[PDB]
Amino acid sequence: TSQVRQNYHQDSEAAINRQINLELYASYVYLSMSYYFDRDDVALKNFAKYFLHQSHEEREHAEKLMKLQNQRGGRIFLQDIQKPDCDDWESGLNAMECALHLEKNVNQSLLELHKLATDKNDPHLCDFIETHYLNEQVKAIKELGDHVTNLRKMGAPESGLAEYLFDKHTLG
């Protein structure tokens, strides 16, 4: 038991470790998406840049959780970072749809972590999740939904013109 540990349940500590893994996994998914759009037979550079930026941001989200774990006197336990489900992400629209799905799963995990905090009467953890994670999730999901809608309305994925113009005018 850490000299700093106070009001920090074992289940909370465990849930923080699972969340660290999931943020790293999200970082990996976006890394994979980024370089998909970098392929010469896809060649959408702003989609590539956009997803690379999200990949780095996910990694910072994981790091903030690792910091929290140590702050509370928990012990970080790392697990393998699983490869993403896809190697080929099909189209800008499909990637955006997949990202939306991803972010909703990450949000679901964060909402379960928050429920756990409530159940264990851990308001420091409640605040950490509310302040640093919940609104970032809502913003990300809204942004991704907006992107999906625009791409669909423009005629993606069948219209390569649509994806090209979106890459320049929204992601550019």
Residue numbers belonging to the annotated binding site for Fe cation: 23, 58, 61, 103, 137
105-124 residues in contact with a second copy (CB under 8 A) are 107-108, 111, 114-115, 118, 121, 123-124
The mark string for 65-84 relative to a second copy (x by CB under 8 A, - otherwise) is -xx-xxxxx-xxxxxxxxxx
Q: Please state the length of the chain.
A: 172
Can residue 160 be called a binding residue for Zn ion (CB under 5 A)?
no
61 binds, among Zn ion, a second copy, none (CB under 5 to 8 A by kind): Zn ion
**3-class DSSP state for residue 171?**
coil
Can residue 126 be called a binding residue for Zn ion (CB under 5 A)?
yes
Specify whether the CB–CB gap between 20 and 65 falls below 8 A.
yes
77 binds, among a second copy, Zn ion, none (CB under 5 to 8 A by kind): a second copy
The Cα-based distances of 14 to 38, 49, 135, 137 in angstroms read 37, 34, 23, 21
CA within 13 Å, CB half, 157: 10
Q: Of 67, 123, 135, 138, which lies in the binding site for Zn ion, with binding defined by CB under 5 A?
A: 123
Nearest to 124 by CA among 67, 62, 68: 68
Residue by residue, DSSP assigns 132-147 as IIIHHHHHHHHHHHHH
Query: Which residue's CB is nearer to a second copy, number 11 or number 172?
Result: 172
The mark string for 119-148 relative to a second copy (x by CB under 8 A, - otherwise) is --x-xx-xxxxxx--xx-xxx-xx-xxxxx
